[PDB]
Design a protein around this ligand. Structure first.
Ligand SMILES: Cc1cc2nc3c(=O)[nH]c(=O)nc-3n(C[C@H](O)[C@H](O)[C@H](O)COP(=O)(O)OP(=O)(O)OC[C@H]3O[C@@H](n4cnc5c(N)ncnc54)[C@H](O)[C@@H]3O)c2cc1C
Ligand SMILES: Cc1cc2nc3c(=O)[nH]c(=O)nc-3n(C[C@H](O)[C@H](O)[C@H](O)COP(=O)(O)OP(=O)(O)OC[C@H]3O[C@@H](n4cnc5c(N)ncnc54)[C@H](O)[C@@H]3O)c2cc1C
Ligand SMILES: NCCCCCCCCCCCCN
Ligand SMILES: NCCCCCCCCCCCCN
Lengths: 499, 494
């Protein structure tokens, strides 16, 4: 009944649809399981009408990111503000010591940079001579360079460099050392409404093409020259080509038995071996977010980027100074509970400086992410959990301890104290249609496989699009966006050319 | 009649010194190290100043400490005996503009951040696209401003280009003389300020027979006798017969060999003449002029926040307007051509506040060409020097919580007592600082021609004869170890 059937209304599938239309193609559909378009791009509304991207927030690699370049051309034409370059000098806060950034004695940013080159030198030209966890790599570095590292550098450096966890959404012991570092193609641009980006692409094709709330439960390839798709509601479709953009985590459900899980699509014939084997190259990290909405700004807007360090011990230094080798240090690190806000690094975007909004956007990683999203409706507990980091931040920013004002109890005796009015938490690890944030590597993985296998398609008719199906922009909004145009282009020609 | 020697080394710089050390270490005997100066070390030279304070007027740091084999060897020592040989002095750079004052780590300018985007822009410009022409570093910066003007503020367009020029002090060349393709390069980790490079020189120089060292003998010619002997002639008339020879004179001095005129201090006459691959390589690589001026003060009475300070050359809002209105690169150059004397604010200057790294109340300042040539050409007129650097010397103190400097070369205010200056450009046996690229240059040609030698018996060593460590003290060092090892094996087979 259709020429092309796109599964998923995230940016990949939306672009793909936008392309097909652009190329005069017709009779296509966009089946989306959620009751909204956007996928991992969602802008929610909070206190006093403030808006926040609960999913993607930035345009990365602005020197070459094509979606960003496109958005920039639009802004040059209409002068409408679509983004703001918010990169800043990071402030680093340790619970006991306070600020440790740009320290005349610690000079942590300089050793972190050395640490970075150490990493590149370890994996460059050796062909993956063993892949460890980012944690293990940092341990090698510390051991190898302790003769040129002070005591405080050995103590704090490993904690500061963990900000990298917030880039993969993975704790440093679950994250591949080889994929930890990546090239940043220029500054980052905070999207002032990724929902604006989603809206544009969504309104660029036949509105009657979109079918919200259609959960696709099975895709069958009948050699007859067509693909049959069945929505969970009973409707069936026959398409020449099908573009699947469900996230990798959802797709990984196919290789498992018991096709009852939400989102899971039964393939017939089953996904070919190169594909199924690719799912052994790890995947899915869990970057999470917590938005803290205050009444008004009453702290120093020195910087828009703040990272709180996990607690560290002088005793750890001693162990590094006494370890004879790696194996001895590996086991010597046997210090024998309870996870608090100081158990992992946290990344706070002070939105007051960059957007003038009295709020903080907080990013978190696995394993913490799922635990916080699990209590997302318990505002009071969430407050108790982050209260100590929040207060430490306010202290360092020439302000006072936070007052809980999430419940209607107006008082003017607190005009010089930050007042929390609301907390918003993401829900990506618990949403069945995302089951996580985006592609990520566990030690021992190699993403190339999935990208090549996904890009090569199930076959000439069953194709794949999404952040996990491409090299440039892997895991990013523009990668997914570009993967959509890719499959669309391939199909666009194969059709129009015939007739 | 001429005294027989197994190997003759020309130049007692770190390359020749290391070459000899490796020969002795390999059991070779009857060797000579001929040096024109009255000292060893060459571009590694430690001088003494006000009250006995010592400074490296040539090489100061151990670069790429994660791989630098020389540095590693120096660290091993210090680990055994626990003695201080070096100090990691990298720090957060303090950046100073004449008016604005400090512009580093600024919440509005964010210069270091756009500076980072710039280098990434350079990487993407060449490292990923063959065929692209070279242009000067200056032209690359303008090309960057033009492409990213939509995403830069006025103060950034104005101050960024002056800040990124700290790179001039890595090459010893003004950004209009510098090859853009060669501007950026990766640093293999932190740097280490040698606390006496002359300690490195002496250690290596005393690891081989002393009688081997012949100071003050300037070599004037080298000849291959079609058979297996090399004739070397000192200027003092002495003559030597040798199986092999490792030439370590600077690239700038070896270039005098392809010119017609035998009476030039340092010039060596070759017979047969240097092969065409060597001669033609000089057209594809050049020499920079990094210079030094060390300001010695009575006592420290300034802030020791950082040990790294860079003074930016003046900029103008007129410049931002031209960048904003330029249609393309062609027009930008046109408008830029909108035309007095040279001042301490005409180019970026890099000062090392030694007070924080070593505790000595003195500033080590680096400068580039063409300024280096001018400043060394008047290095004797101390009064004129003070006058020249007084403006910047004062702005630094103003920014480091202090007052104007007081000339005391002849209670809480900084008093200048001495001004020492380098002399590498005018010195006949150095003629510049080290190898560097002008736009269009390709260092590979030279490194290739040098590492393959004039022939089987006539070899070359030195900072200009190797890829890893090119221009650095450890590169020369390694090149010396290279030529001596190959020779040892060949002699070994006898
Ligand atoms: C917390 C967080 C922060 C992030 N921040 C950034 C950032 O700053 N910058 C950046 O570039 N990227 C960021 N990302 C990643 C970025 O959001 C994603 O790469 C991108 O949105 C993925 O798009 P997609 O179209 O491939 O998939 P979506 O993930 O867009 O997937 C497409 C659609 O598939 C649908 N679907 C699933 N199963 C079925 C089914 N069975 N039937 C029908 N439809 C189905 C889903 O409902 C979904 O709408 C972030 C991600 C997270 C989780
Ligand atoms: C101002 C300045 C700062 C520097 N800073 C650093 C730094 O921080 N870190 C770093 O790694 N490098 C630095 N360098 C570079 C470093 O000093 C050189 O790479 C290295 O010392 C060159 O050593 P060489 O043995 O190759 O040559 P020299 O240049 O060492 O040459 C060897 C010898 O040849 C002798 N000679 C010349 N002609 C004749 C002749 N006709 N007969 C006999 N002998 C002759 C010379 O007198 C000289 O002593 C700096 C250089 C300069 C000029
Ligand atoms: N501090 C940055 C927070 C947002 C990070 C988004 C990263 C997207 C790209 C991931 C690249 C690696 C994918 N395996
Ligand atoms: N910081 C003073 C200079 C330190 C040594 C720099 C060596 C390389 C200079 C450029 C020429 C060699 C690489 N092309």
């Amino acid at each position: 009944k259709k020429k092309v059937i796109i599964i998923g209304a995230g940016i990949a599938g939306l672009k793909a649809a936008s392309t097909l239309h652009q190329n005069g193609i017709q009779d296509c559909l966009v089946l989306e399981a959620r009751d909204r378009v956007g996928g991992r791009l969602q802008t929610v509304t909070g206190y006093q009408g403030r808006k926040y991207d609960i999913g993607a927030s930035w345009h990365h690699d602005t020197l070459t990111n094509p979606l960003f370049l496109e958005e920039a051309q639009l802004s040059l034409n209409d002068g409408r503000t679509r983004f703001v370059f918010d990169d800043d000098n990071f402030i680093y806060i340790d619970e006991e010591r306070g600020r440790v950034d740009h320290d005349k004695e610690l000079l942590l940013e300089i050793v972190d940079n050395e640490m970075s080159k150490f990493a590149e030198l370890e994996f460059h030209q050796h062909l993956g001579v063993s892949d460890c966890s980012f944690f293990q790599l940092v341990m090698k570095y510390l051991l190898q360079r302790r003769q040129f590292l002070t005591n405080d550098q050995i103590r704090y450096l490993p904690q500061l460099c963990r900000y990298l966890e917030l880039w993969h959404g993975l704790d440093w012991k679950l994250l591949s050392a080889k994929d930890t570092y990546f090239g940043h193609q220029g500054r980052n641009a905070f999207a002032l409404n990724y929902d604006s980006v989603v809206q544009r692409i969504a309104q660029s094709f036949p509105q009657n093409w979109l079918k919200l709330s259609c959960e696709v439960k099975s895709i069958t390839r009948e050699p007859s020259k067509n693909v049959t798709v069945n929505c969970e509601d009973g409707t069936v479709y026959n398409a020449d080509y099908v573009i699947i953009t469900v996230p990798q985590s959802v797709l990984n459900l196919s290789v498992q038995p018991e096709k009852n899980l939400r989102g899971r699509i039964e393939f017939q014939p089953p996904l070919k071996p190169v594909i199924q084997d690719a799912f052994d190259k790890i995947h899915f990290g869990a970057l999470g977010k917590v938005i803290f909405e205050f009444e008004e700004c009453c702290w120093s807007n020195e910087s828009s980027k703040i990272v709180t360090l996990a607690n560290s011990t002088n005793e750890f230094v001693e162990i590094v100074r006494n370890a004879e080798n790696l194996d001895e240090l590996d086991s010597m690190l046997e210090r024998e509970t309870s996870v608090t806000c100081w158990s992992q690094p946290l990344f706070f975007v002070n939105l007051s400086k960059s957007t003038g909004v009295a709020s903080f956007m907080m990013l978190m990683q696995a394993p913490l992410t799922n635990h916080i999203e699990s209590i997302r409706e318990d505002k009071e507990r969430l407050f108790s959990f982050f209260q100590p980091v929040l207060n430490k931040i306010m202290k360092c920013l020439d302000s006072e301890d936070v007052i809980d004002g999430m419940r209607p109890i107006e008082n003017i005796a607190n005009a010089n104290k930050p007042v929390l009015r609301n907390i918003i938490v993401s829900n990506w690890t618990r949403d069945p249609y995302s089951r996580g944030a985006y592609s990520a590597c566990f030690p021992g993985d190699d993403p190339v496989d999935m990208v090549v296998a996904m890009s090569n398609g199930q076959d000439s008719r069953i194709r794949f699009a999404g952040e996990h199906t491409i090299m440039d922009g892997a895991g990013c909004a523009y990668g997914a966006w570009e993967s959509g145009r890719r499959e669309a282009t391939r199909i666009s020609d194969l059709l129009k050319l015939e007739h």
